[PDB]
Amino acid sequence: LAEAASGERPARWALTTGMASIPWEYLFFYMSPAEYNRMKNYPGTFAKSASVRIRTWNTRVAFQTGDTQTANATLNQNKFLQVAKGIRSIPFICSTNRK
Amino acid sequence: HDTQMPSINVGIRAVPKLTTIDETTQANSWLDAQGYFEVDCVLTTESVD
Amino acid sequence: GAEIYLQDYLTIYTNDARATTGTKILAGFPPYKNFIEEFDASACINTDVV
Amino acid sequence: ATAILRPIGLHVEKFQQTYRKKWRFLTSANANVILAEAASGERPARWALTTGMASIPWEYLFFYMSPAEYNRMKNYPGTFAKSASVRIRTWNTRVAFQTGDTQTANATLNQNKFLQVAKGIRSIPFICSTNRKYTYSDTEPMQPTGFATLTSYEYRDGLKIAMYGYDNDSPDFAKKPPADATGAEIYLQDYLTIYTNDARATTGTKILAGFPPYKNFIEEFDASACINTDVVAMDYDFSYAPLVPQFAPVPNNLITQNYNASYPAGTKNEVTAAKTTDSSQATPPTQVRNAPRKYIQGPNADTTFFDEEQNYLRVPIEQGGIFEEVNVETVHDTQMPSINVGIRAVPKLTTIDETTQANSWLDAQGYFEVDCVLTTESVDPYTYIKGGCYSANTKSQLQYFANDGRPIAKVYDNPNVYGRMQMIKTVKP
Amino acid sequence: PYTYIKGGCYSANTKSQLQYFANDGRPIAKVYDNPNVYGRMQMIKTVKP
Amino acid sequence: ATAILRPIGLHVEKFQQTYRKKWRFLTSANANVILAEAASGERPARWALTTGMASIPWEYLFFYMSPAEYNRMKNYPGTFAKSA
DNA sequence: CAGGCCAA
DNA sequence: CAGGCCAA
DNA sequence: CAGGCCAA
DNA sequence: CAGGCCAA
Numbered sequence A: 001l002a003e004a005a006s007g008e009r010p011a012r013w014a015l016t017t018g019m020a021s022i023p024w025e026y027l028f029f030y031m032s033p034a035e036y037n038r039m040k041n042y043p044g045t046f047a048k049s050a051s052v053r054i055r056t057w058n059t060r061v062a063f064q065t066g067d068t069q070t071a072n073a074t075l076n077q078n079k080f081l082q083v084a085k086g087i088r089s090i091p092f093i094c095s096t097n098r099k
Numbered sequence B: 001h002d003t004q005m006p007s008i009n010v011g012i013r014a015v016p017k018l019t020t021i022d023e024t025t026q027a028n029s030w031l032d033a034q035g036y037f038e039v040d041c042v043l044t045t046e047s048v049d
Numbered sequence C: 001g002a003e004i005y006l007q008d009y010l011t012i013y014t015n016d017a018r019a020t021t022g023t024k025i026l027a028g029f030p031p032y033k034n035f036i037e038e039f040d041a042s043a044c045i046n047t048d049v050v
Numbered sequence D: 001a002t003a004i005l006r007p008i009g010l011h012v013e014k015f016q017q018t019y020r021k022k023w024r025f026l027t028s029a030n031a032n033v034i035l036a037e038a039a040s041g042e043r044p045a046r047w048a049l050t051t052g053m054a055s056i057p058w059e060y061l062f063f064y065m066s067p068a069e070y071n072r073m074k075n076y077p078g079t080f081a082k083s084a085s086v087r088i089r090t091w092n093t094r095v096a097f098q099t100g101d102t103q104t105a106n107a108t109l110n111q112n113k114f115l116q117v118a119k120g121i122r123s124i125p126f127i128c129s130t131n132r133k134y135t136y137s138d139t140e141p142m143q144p145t146g147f148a149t150l151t152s153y154e155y156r157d158g159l160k161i162a163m164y165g166y167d168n169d170s171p172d173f174a175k176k177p178p179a180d181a182t183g184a185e186i187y188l189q190d191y192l193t194i195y196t197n198d199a200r201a202t203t204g205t206k207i208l209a210g211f212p213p214y215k216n217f218i219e220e221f222d223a224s225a226c227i228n229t230d231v232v233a234m235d236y237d238f239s240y241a242p243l244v245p246q247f248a249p250v251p252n253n254l255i256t257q258n259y260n261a262s263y264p265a266g267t268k269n270e271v272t273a274a275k276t277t278d279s280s281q282a283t284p285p286t287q288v289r290n291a292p293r294k295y296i297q298g299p300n301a302d303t304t305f306f307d308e309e310q311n312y313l314r315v316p317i318e319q320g321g322i323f324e325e326v327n328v329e330t331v332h333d334t335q336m337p338s339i340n341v342g343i344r345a346v347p348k349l350t351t352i353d354e355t356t357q358a359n360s361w362l363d364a365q366g367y368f369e370v371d372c373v374l375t376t377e378s379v380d381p382y383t384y385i386k387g388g389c390y391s392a393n394t395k396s397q398l399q400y401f402a403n404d405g406r407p408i409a410k411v412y413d414n415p416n417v418y419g420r421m422q423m424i425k426t427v428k429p
Numbered sequence E: 001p002y003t004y005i006k007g008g009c010y011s012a013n014t015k016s017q018l019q020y021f022a023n024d025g026r027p028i029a030k031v032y033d034n035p036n037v038y039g040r041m042q043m044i045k046t047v048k049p
Numbered sequence F: 001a002t003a004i005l006r007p008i009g010l011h012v013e014k015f016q017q018t019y020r021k022k023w024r025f026l027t028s029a030n031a032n033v034i035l036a037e038a039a040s041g042e043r044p045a046r047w048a049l050t051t052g053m054a055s056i057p058w059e060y061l062f063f064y065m066s067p068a069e070y071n072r073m074k075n076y077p078g079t080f081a082k083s084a
Numbered sequence G, H, I, J: 001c002a003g004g005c006c007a008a
Helices: A033-039 D067-073 D152-164 F067-073
Strands: A012-021 A046-056 A080-085 A095-098 B008-012 B037-046 C009-015 C037-040 D011-028 D034-037 D046-055 D080-090 D114-119 D129-132 D134-136 D144-147 D185-187 D191-197 D219-222 D229-237 D273-276 D286-289 D293-295 D323-325 D339-343 D364-382 D397-400 D408-410 D423-425 E028-030 E043-045 F003-005 F034-037 F046-049
Touching: A012 A080, A012 A095, A046 B008, B008 C009, D011 D046, D011 D339, D034 D144, D046 D114, D046 D129, D046 D364, D080 D339, D114 D229, D152 D185, D191 D339, D229 D339, D339 D364, D364 F067, D397 D408
Parallel strands: D011 D185
Antiparallel strands: A012 B008, A012 C009, A046 B037, A080 B008, A080 C037, A095 C009, C037 F003, D011 D364, D034 D046, D046 D191, D046 D339, D080 D229, D080 D364, D114 D219, D114 D339, D129 D191, D134 D144, D273 D286, D293 D397, D323 D397, D408 D423, E028 E043, F034 F046
């Protein structure tokens, strides 16, 4: 995808992926508004450790594309899961998470 | 010292359509596919009085 | 406990030199697939991945 | 006595480099259909038997190493490709659930699914074959109905661009995301085709031998049992694959009046010879010593082959018999074995009324994971104290040249002649 | 290093190197010619050959 | 699960090179004589005590590697001297 | 069962 | 194979 | 007994 | 560490 230059941002090419970002670095991910509001009444609070475990379930693939002009429906599937740890910190892969 | 939390990205690779394209290139049509991810997260905090 | 659709995905960027004046960098993309793990999702049903 | 000096010899630096790629290929299960190819110039009229076995271009440098790696390797004179290995793994093979012909209820859960592997078909003396791109019918997308005009150079260039993408200044940059970065599948379009003579207009004694039984030379397995299994594992040691020419020696003609001297070769052949053969049997096989050639480094160097970079994707990596060295040398003809993999066409569940081959096929794709490794070596010889690297003059290299000045190189595109890959004139890109 | 697919070798930007320079543009380098100062070799402006 | 991809990282090629020289040096047994050095600009007036201990220029690149080697090494960006 | 032929 | 660079 | 001081 | 090249 082409991203036009805007102000200080140069013109660049964007390579889209299907690897969804997991927002485990933020406080709302772990604790509800009630917990946040109560924690506000505990001055001196430091977050000590954050752990995340991700389990994948059955991955659904469409049986057909819906293009009526082709008979592309098939029982067989090649189905791959992509996991990316620490891509954000790689000095030479300029990347960010986008909608 | 400077700090960083490692990023986590998970996803499913796009599944090409069973159509036959006429040129040596990447697929131009893909089947709908969803990843189903169960996420367990724990946060530990401490405070002092 | 219902599922939530995620909409925020990793995007890889590289320079666009179509309007670049001077010495252009034409290095293409970095091979980002050399830095990720990929598994057959049919074998990963109900398995810890991260 | 304490040896204050000893013959430590020259300073030579050898560098070994490794190039790895991973490619995912999608192959069509093309039907076995006879196609007519009209006579064109020197090409006779012939019948073509199409297959679904896609060619794997493991004989070319772009298969293993990216444009950045190629450009950097250019700065390492004396580079030889040492070994090329390819591992091919097939994944689940998809077969269309239905043909799409609404007038029949051909949809079925059951599948017969076969994977075809062909090693070294290109070298078989009596199976005249080459890899071709087909055109397909609209009603039957898996049925070839002709040949595309896309040549082998154009095919490999397109495959390279799919592998590595365009330059950032290209207006068509977005069209091809690099598979080297994405890991996405690439559709292969170059399939093994079997040829036989077309005697419809032949005058005189006709040969009516039909086709050779090429299925007696391939492996075929139930593709349902081959999911995530290695199917091809082949290594190749290169006899002589100069990727960048040697460092030029210090010319002895600037130091010596003896540079143009003669010495006995004895009964050994220190100069290579080109064998010309004639399958029409109009001319006997001919061996010609001292074919026209010129140096690829030195005062009168002609580096057209390495400046047109024929060796990236136009010309195969190995060029044994094309390149001479100025020394007592043993040189033999060379070939890299061909690799073709594919899925056999899956017939439609329709019932035809005649005893013959199926006339309708389900769409089927082969999913092939290809692992390839290329090993190269280069040298930095210091024969002299100053001026940079210089090699010994016995390391000087010559390349066969045509009389018009076009470098001659080995090609794996045309069918074999007596089991030999021909040498042909290179074409300027 | 091959950080990118095309264009030749490129290193990571964390491998970028700077050299001390004088305000007039002459590179500054270590020299072992002058006597030590507090046991230290000085850095001096390089002279154009 | 069969890992179709794994983080193999970048392709980086490291090249190690060795440069050797053998030199024979003749040194004079200079006497220990005090020499006067007049003040010049920022340099003060000082007494100099001469010795016969010749300096060995092992801290410089020409000591180990010839002009041909230096010119070729110029075509290897990222070169660090490891040990002398 | 591949690399200068295979029926060596 | 993640956390202040990786080719340490 | 050398390399950012030696009397550390 | 020599004899049809040596970086084989």
